Symmetry: C2
């Protein structure tokens, strides 16, 4: 599907998520004013995170290697 | 719930949706770069629509007045 709305991030979480709550991730479209990663947790919550930060890169990396 | 991603339209459906498919609507955040209305259909398709189009204005008013 699409003309689906596209997910964009305008603020980012202050505080790092327990890595074992993390089920998945994606990168927000380049169409967004800001760049971002969206982590999907096990409860299926979606969280906006700052792609510059180490923990998000780590978590993304770990997710891609698994 | 937040820090959810916010929904933004980057383009608009170009065929008017038959009105009796419409289940609901929301307006996109003013943080998006473009205005929008996301219509939700009876089957749960989310559809981005130009709020400056006449039929969208109509559908929105009809939803609000019932």
């Amino acid at each position: 599907a699409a003309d689906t709305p596209t997910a964009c991030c305008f603020s980012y979480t202050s505080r790092q998520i327990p890595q074992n709550f993390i089920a998945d991730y994606f990168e927000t479209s380049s169409q967004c004013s800001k760049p971002g990663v969206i982590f999907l947790t096990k409860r299926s919550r979606q969280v906006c995170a700052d792609p510059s930060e180490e923990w998000v890169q780590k978590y993304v990396s770990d997710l891609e290697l698994s």
